[PDB]
Amino acid sequence: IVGGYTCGANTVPYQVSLNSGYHFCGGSLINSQWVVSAAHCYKSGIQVRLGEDNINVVEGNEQFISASKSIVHPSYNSNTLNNDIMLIKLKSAASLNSRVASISLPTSCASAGTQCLISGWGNTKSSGTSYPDVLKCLKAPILSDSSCKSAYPGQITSNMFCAGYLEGGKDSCQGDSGGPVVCSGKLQGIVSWGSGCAQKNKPGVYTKVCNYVSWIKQTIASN
Numbered sequence: 001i002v003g004g005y006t007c008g009a010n011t012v013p014y015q016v017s018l019n020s021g022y023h024f025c026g027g028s029l030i031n032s033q034w035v036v037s038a039a040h041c042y043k044s045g046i047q048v049r050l051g052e053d054n055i056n057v058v059e060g061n062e063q064f065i066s067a068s069k070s071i072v073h074p075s076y077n078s079n080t081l082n083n084d085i086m087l088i089k090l091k092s093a094a095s096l097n098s099r100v101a102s103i104s105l106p107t108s109c110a111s112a113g114t115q116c117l118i119s120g121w122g123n124t125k126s127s128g129t130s131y132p133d134v135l136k137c138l139k140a141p142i143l144s145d146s147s148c149k150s151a152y153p154g155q156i157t158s159n160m161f162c163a164g165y166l167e168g169g170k171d172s173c174q175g176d177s178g179g180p181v182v183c184s185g186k187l188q189g190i191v192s193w194g195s196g197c198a199q200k201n202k203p204g205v206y207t208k209v210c211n212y213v214s215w216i217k218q219t220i221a222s223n
């Protein structure tokens with residue numbers, strides 16, 4: 001997250017870190033046994049880390065649970081990033097409390113102008129590299145589809161939205177991928193892609209979760 005603020009420990013209780021020996025992507029806990037992340041974060045050997053603030057220090061609220069099954073969306077396209085969503089099933093259920101909690105799925109899509117919270121452990125610089133140990137947060141609005149398509153001609157599908165600031169300076173970045181965009185207490189986006197970080201006229205692009213609720217629910221019910 002570029003241009004954000006330190007969230008505070010366990011203030012984003014649905015945020016998870018995906019770990020394969022190191023943090024590589026975020027995700028969101030949607031019930032006690034399932035996480036949603038970006039398909040471009042797929043790999044084998046994932047441990048899900050719940051209850052984290054500092055990802056390099058054991059602080060006492062963590063739960064570390066291995067994945068048993070990962071399911072990339074059936075229509076994910078790695079070239080265009082269309083349908084950039086996956087589900088991860090945990091080997092055992094997490095223990096839910098005030099510091100480790102699920103986030104609700106949306107019943108309707110959010111409109112442009114809605115303010116959302118984006119969070120992650122990604123790079124904090126737009127030029128150069130500095131990775132934080134503690135969770136960072138950013139409040140940002142959803143942008144109109146027309147603005148989004150103007151910024152990225154030919155690249156925005158109906159399964160994507162832009163959020164952020166056309167003036168630059170505040171954005172998600174490398175290492176934030178897969179993490180949550182929460183608006184009015186519902187999961188509306190997944191950190192997906194952009195051109196650089198925090199550049200003028202190049203806001204972040206997010207997977208539009210409201211288009212996937214049916215697939216999520218039916219997949220969980222059967223797996």
Ligand SMILES: [Ca+2]
Nearest residue numbers: 054057058059
């Ligand atoms: Ca920790």
